[PDB]
C-alpha cells in the first residue's frame, strides 16, 4: 500500500551503488570516492557521468504540499537530502572530468530560482560549482552565504582597524 521504491531503482547498477553509498551520512562523499576507485578496478573502468547527469534532471511526478497538488520534480530534488549534499561535494571533487552541458542543467536545479522553502546547502554548493567552472561570476551579490550572515559579518569587521593592504581595486 504505502511501500515506496527507491528513486534510484531504474538506474544503471554502478550509479545505484554510488547513490546508495552517498546516503550514509557525512562519510558519504569519501565512500563515493571509494566506490569510484572500485569501478576503475572492475571491467567497466569508465563511469558514465553523462548518463547519471541526465537521470539527475529527469522528472517524475509527486503530490506534496496540500493533500492534492501535482508537481514534477527532477531526481536531484527527489532523492534523500544527504545523498544530495554528498553528491554535490563529490562533483566538486571530480569537476574536471565532467560534461559542462549536463552540469549546467544540474546547477539550474540547484539554484532553485522561484521556489519557497529552498535548500540553502544545495544553492550554496551550486554557487561554489559555478565559481569553479568560471561561468558564474554572475555580476551579482550571489555568494554561498546568506544576506543575514554577510551583514552580521560586516557588522563585526566594522569594529576592527582596516589593514594597509589594497585588495579591492577602485
Partner 1 sequence: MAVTEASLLRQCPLLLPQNRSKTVYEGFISAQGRDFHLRIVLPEDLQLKNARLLCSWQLRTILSGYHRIVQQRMQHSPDLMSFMMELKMLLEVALKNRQELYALPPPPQFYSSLIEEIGTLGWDKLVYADTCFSTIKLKAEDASGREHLITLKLKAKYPAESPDYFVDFPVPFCASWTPQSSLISIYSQFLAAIESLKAFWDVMDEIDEKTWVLEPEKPPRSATARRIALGNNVSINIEVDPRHPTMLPECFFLGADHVVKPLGIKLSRNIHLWDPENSVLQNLKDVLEIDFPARAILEKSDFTMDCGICYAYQLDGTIPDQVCDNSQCGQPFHQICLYEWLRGLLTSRQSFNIIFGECPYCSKPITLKM
Partner 2 sequence: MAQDSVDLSCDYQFWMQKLSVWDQASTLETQQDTCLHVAQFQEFLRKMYEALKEMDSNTVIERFPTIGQLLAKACWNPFILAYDESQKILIWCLCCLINKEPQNSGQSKLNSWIQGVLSHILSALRFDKEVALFTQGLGYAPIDYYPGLLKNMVLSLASELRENHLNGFNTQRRMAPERVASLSRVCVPLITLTDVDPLVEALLICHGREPQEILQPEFFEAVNEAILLKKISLPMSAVVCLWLRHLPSLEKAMLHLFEKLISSERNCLRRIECFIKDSSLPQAACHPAIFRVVDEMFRCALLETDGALEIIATIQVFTQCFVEALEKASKQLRFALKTYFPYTSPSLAMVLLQDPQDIPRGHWLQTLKHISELLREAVEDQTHGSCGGPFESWFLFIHFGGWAEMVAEQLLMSAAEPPTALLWLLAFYYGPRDGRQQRAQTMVQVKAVLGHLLAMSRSSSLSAQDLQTVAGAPAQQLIRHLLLNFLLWAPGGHTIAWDVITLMAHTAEITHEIIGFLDQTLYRWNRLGIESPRSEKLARELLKELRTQV
Q: Quick check: 141 binds partner 2 (CB under 8 A)?
A: no
Q: Quick check: 138 binds partner 2 (CB under 8 A)?
A: no
Residue matched to cell numbers 576507485? 37
Alpha helices by DSSP H, listed for the chain, are: 13-22, 28-40, 49-55, 81-93, 100-111, 120-133, 147-157
Element spanning 74, H or E: strand 70-74
**100 binds, options partner 1, partner 2, none, Cβ within 5 to 8 A by partner type:** partner 1
Q: Which is nearer to partner 2, 38 or 101 (CB)?
A: 38
Q: Quick check: 108 binds partner 2 (CB under 8 A)?
A: no
**13 binds, options partner 1, partner 2, none, Cβ within 5 to 8 A by partner type:** partner 1
Quote the least distance from Cβ 114 to partner 1, whole Å: 18
Contact 149, 156 (CB under 8 A): no
Q: Which is nearer to partner 1, 53 or 110 (CB)?
A: 53
Q: Cα(102)–Cα(53) distance, rounded to whole angstroms?
A: 6
Amino acid at each position: 500500500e504505502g511501500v515506496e521504491p527507491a528513486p534510484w531503482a531504474q538506474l544503471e547498477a554502478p550509479a545505484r551503488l554510488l547513490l546508495q553509498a552517498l546516503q550514509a551520512g557525512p562519510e558519504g562523499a569519501r565512500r563515493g570516492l571509494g566506490v569510484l576507485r572500485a569501478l576503475g578496478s572492475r571491467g567497466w573502468e569508465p563511469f558514465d557521468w553523462g548518463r547519471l547527469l541526465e537521470a539527475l534532471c529527469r522528472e517524475e511526478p509527486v503530490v506534496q504540499g496540500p493533500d492534492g497538488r501535482l508537481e514534477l520534480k527532477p531526481l536531484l530534488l527527489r532523492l534523500p537530502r544527504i545523498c544530495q549534499r554528498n553528491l554535490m561535494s563529490l562533483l566538486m571533487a571530480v569537476r574536471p572530468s565532467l560534461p559542462e552541458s549536463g552540469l549546467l542543467s544540474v546547477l539550474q536545479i540547484a539554484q532553485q530560482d522561484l521556489a519557497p522553502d529552498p535548500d540553502a546547502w544545495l544553492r550554496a554548493l551550486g554557487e561554489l560549482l559555478r565559481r569553479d567552472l568560471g561561468v558564474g561570476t554572475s555580476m551579482e551579490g550571489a555568494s554561498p552565504l546568506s544576506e543575514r550572515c554577510q551583514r552580521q559579518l560586516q557588522s563585526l569587521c566594522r569594529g576592527l582597524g582596516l589593514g594597509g593592504r589594497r585588495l579591492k581595486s577602485p
